[PDB]
Amino acid sequence: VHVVSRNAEGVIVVDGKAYPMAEELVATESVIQRSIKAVAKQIADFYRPLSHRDTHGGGGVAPISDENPLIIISVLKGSYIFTADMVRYLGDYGLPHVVDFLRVAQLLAETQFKALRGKHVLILEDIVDSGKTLRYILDKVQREHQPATLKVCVLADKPGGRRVTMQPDFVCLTVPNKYVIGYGFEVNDRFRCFRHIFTLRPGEARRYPAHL
Amino acid sequence: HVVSRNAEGVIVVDGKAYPMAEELVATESVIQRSIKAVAKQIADFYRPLSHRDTHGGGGVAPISDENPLIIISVLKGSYIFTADMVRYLGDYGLPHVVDFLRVASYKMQLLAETQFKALRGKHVLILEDIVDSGKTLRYILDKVQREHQPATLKVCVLADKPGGRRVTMQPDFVCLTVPNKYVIGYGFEVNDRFRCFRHIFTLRPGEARRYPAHL
Ligand SMILES: O=c1[nH]cnc2c(CN[C@@H](CO)CCP(=O)(O)O)c[nH]c12
Ligand SMILES: O=c1[nH]cnc2c(CN[C@@H](CO)CCP(=O)(O)O)c[nH]c12
Secondary structure, rough: OOOEEEEOOOOOEEOEEOOOEEEEEEEOHHHHHHHHHHHHHHHHHOOOOOOOEEOOOOOOEEEOOOOEEEEEEEOOOHHHHHHHHHHHHHHHHHOOOEEEEEEEEEEEEEEOOOOOOOOOEEEEEEEEEOOHHHHHHHHHEEEEEEEOOEEEEEEEOOHHHOOOOOOOOOEEOOOOOOOOOEEOEOOOOOOOOOOOEEOOOOOOOHHOOOOO | EEEEEOOOEEEEOOEEEEEOOEEEEEEEHHHHHHHHHHHHHHHHHHOOOOEEOOOOOHHHHHHOOOOOOOEEEEEEOOHHHHHHHHHHHHHHOOOEEEEEEEEOOOOOEEEOOOOOOOOOOOEEEEEEEEOOOOOHHHHHHHHHHHOOOOOEEEEEEEEEEEHHHHOOOOOEEEEOOOOOOOOOOOEEOOOOOOOOOOEEEEEOOOHHHOOOOOO
């Protein structure tokens, strides 16, 4: 159980640690991890039955296996902690998979995987808010890799912030229509190390204006 | 944890078989206890230090959320280790930020550059999965020092394979010491396979060319 309280300064305290930058708690580590593991079982149950191009034994189609694993593309930098946890749960459920990374801001870093044609590909992303970043990534991966199927798993969905149509295939958590921090979520790279997700106090997104 | 061998002689950890493994090096519990211990050492070492103030356009200021410790994680092998380390560093209250670089051998070449552009006069810590020959980290350390001119440059490794050294390299922080064998699990892999394992194992010698096709 997590002990959630407020100190004399009105600041949220979780397990004895103060979060002066936070407005409200969204989810404790225990809720987050249970949510990720639940989605991990959904992903393993969905993909383990499927088949795709055979690049190990010369063709044509073969079941997802260690020889022909599910291809996972993780979006850096926001999804790295979520991806680290998700892949370990996927391993627990016996899903054969491999992970590669793309970095976006503009594309800053490209995938090194060069044989995704006719493969099942899953994108791990931290959050869908406006839908624009995933629309950009999905168009690029489809056009350059020509996968058999392309699906998206997000840690968080902020359904009220949409500016374009984007419905992820897998969602671990629904977040309020507020700026979130913690468990990968940042303010200029600060707060990603938190084990819990919180809403940010209004105006604190300008707390660290200096480029790192 | 329960670690045994089945009737086929295959290592089984917590009811799970690892037919590719020769020996178990470390269980999840040992690895996690080891990482948190080094996190306390890193927090105890950096907490009281000061460096260039880029927040208040000042001269020098203590390590803080305004001027955090700069952490550079070496992709891809270090991402799981880094994810866990940062959360332990947060438990110990070390203000820090993380960026990523990626190197490969052909001789070494940079695959992905860091995006941080104000590291001069800052304390920098490299997070790497393993030091074996020492060649990758001598390359990374030489490049970060020359291009960023940090105040201090230190290295934390999840694993030290002491018997593999071909150039002088002793990381400042080491979570685990591994045998002089090919390790797998917890970030370590064979063509990207086995990274998801929660335990570290040695690889059976005939399993290293099992997945020859490029991904
Ligand atoms: O709430 C939040 N807290 C911290 N960061 C974010 C982001 C930025 N995330 C990137 C993806 O990594 C773009 C998503 P999109 O284009 O879909 O808006 C949206 N909401 C939040
Ligand atoms: O044993 C191992 N199992 C799985 N991978 C490796 C690597 C590759 N790791 C790089 C950094 O990612 C360091 C190379 P080095 O220090 O030799 O220059 C060395 N040993 C092993």
